[PDB]
Amino acid sequence: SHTVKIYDTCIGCTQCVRACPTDVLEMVPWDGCKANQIASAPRTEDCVGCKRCESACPTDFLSVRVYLGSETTRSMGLAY
């Protein structure tokens, strides 16, 4: 169970959502950027910590951050 956070620096490019391999992020309406959408992490319990979302964020600094925390059977990617 990692901690995923989204900051107002996001431009709503939706790249982090498309790069997530476990469907943890989604786009919700917003009004702080031209795209009128912000990213969110409603299913952080399924986050594995690959940080693929950070590698896709184009803002400087990153608008999406993943802080690895307590490891679970899902966050560790264990199939056994």
Partner: protein, 143 residues
């Protein structure tokens, strides 16, 4: 107006000869996932567990271990065969929970009616200092 579609147990599985990379003992005591899709023709596809299977013409059901495997298969179907699927989580007791297309709309598309969970209204460097939250089981990002 969207409701989670129920999981049909009468859906046939794709033609596969079997492999050693399938479900193990975790699915019997913890949980497993099921991905169901609709194909317009019988065609060969690559399974996330190794090998090649043949999806039938119509409804197809595939049970995998982790949710990432189901999502990878869905990505392959969407980018190769333009097929949309649904992912569910099944527990040993018999409970099915809808997953990925949560509100019928893909997460990459805004739907206006979702939960803006975990969205700070500050910058990455505007977090509290680690010394200001000492002796508290929380990181500076949770304030």
């Amino acid at each position: 107006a969207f409701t989670p579609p129920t999981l049909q147990s009468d859906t046939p599985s794709p033609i596969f000869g079997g492999s050693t990379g399938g479900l193990l003992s975790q699915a019997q005591v913890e949980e497993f996932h099921v991905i169901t899709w609709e194909s317009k023709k019988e065609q060969i596809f690559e399974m996330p567990t190794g090998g090649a299977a043949i999806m039938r013409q119509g409804p197809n059901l595939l049970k995998l271990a982790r949710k990432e495997q189901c999502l990878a298969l869905l990505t392959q179907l969407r980018t190769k065969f333009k097929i949309d699927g649904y992912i569910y989580r099944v527990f040993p007791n018999g409970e099915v929970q809808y997953l990925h297309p949560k509100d019928g709309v893909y997460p990459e598309k805004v739907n206006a009616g979702r939960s803006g969970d975990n969205t700070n209204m500050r910058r990455i460097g505007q977090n509290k200092e680690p010394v200001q939250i000492k002796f508290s089981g929380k990181i500076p990002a949770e304030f």
